[PDB]
């Protein structure tokens, strides 16, 4: 399957691709703006992930740095990025048919639409200023809004029984996004595609 990342965004990002144990294509690289980068997923792939990551820096090895989204500070993605992190998640070839969302379980640092570029699906979006309008007790001191298990670590606001209902901080991205995911156990926004579509990330889509 083929991905086309694109930074619309009017500053720099280095877009990061994983299924947590493994890269996805070369796993990460530089977007500066209006940039596009086309990976290629294997199919089959399933809890995969595509992320932006900001204020990078790294060295002729591709170890460095970044302020949202670092893995292990490898250029080249090998695992899931550090929040806050707006998520671009897909599973493929499952049974015939393709599922993708978009969530803000992570956080969320960059605007992002993630639509296929084949026929049969819709695409989703979340583009709002989250940033911007962040509660104070979500705001990243390193830069962008953090989910609140991130910040606070309590059974209610990281699902970890498995039993948790929305809270005045899933709410928010709610409200801003509603077609990504807020929370664990939030009514689902996962697009079905045909199994084998292909897509396109867009950074700053609006």
């Keep these: 399957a083929t991905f086309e990342i694109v930074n619309r965004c009017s500053y720099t990002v280095w877009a ?24 290629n997923v294997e199919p089959g792939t399933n809890g ?22 670092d893995c292990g ?3 080249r993605c090998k695992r899931f990025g550090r929040p806050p992190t707006t998520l671009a998640e897909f599973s493929l070839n499952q049974y015939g048919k393709d599922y993708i969302d978009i969530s803000n379980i992570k956080g969320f640092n960059v605007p992002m639409d993630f639509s296929p570029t084949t026929r ?10 989250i940033v911007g309008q962040c509660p104070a007790k979500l705001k990243a001191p390193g830069g962008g809004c953090n989910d609140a298990c991130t910040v606070f670590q309590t059974s209610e606001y990281c699902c970890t029984t498995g039993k948790c209902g929305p809270t005045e901080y899933s709410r928010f ?14 009514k689902p926004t996962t697009v079905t595609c045909p199994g084998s579509s292909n897509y396109r990330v867009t950074f700053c889509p609006t």
């Design 48 to 69: 995969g992930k595509i992320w932006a990551r900001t204020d990078c820096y790294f060295d002729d090895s591709g170890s460095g740095i970044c302020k949202t989204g």
């Design 173 to 186: 991205f709610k409200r801003l996004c509603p077609d990504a995911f807020s929370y664990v156990l939030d």
């Design 120 to 129: 049969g699906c819709r695409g989703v979006r979340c583009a709002a200023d």
């Design 16 to 39: 990061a691709a994983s299924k947590g144990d493994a890269a996805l294509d070369a796993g990460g690289r530089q977007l500066n703006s209006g940039e596009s980068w086309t990976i």
């Design 73 to 75: 500070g490898l250029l």
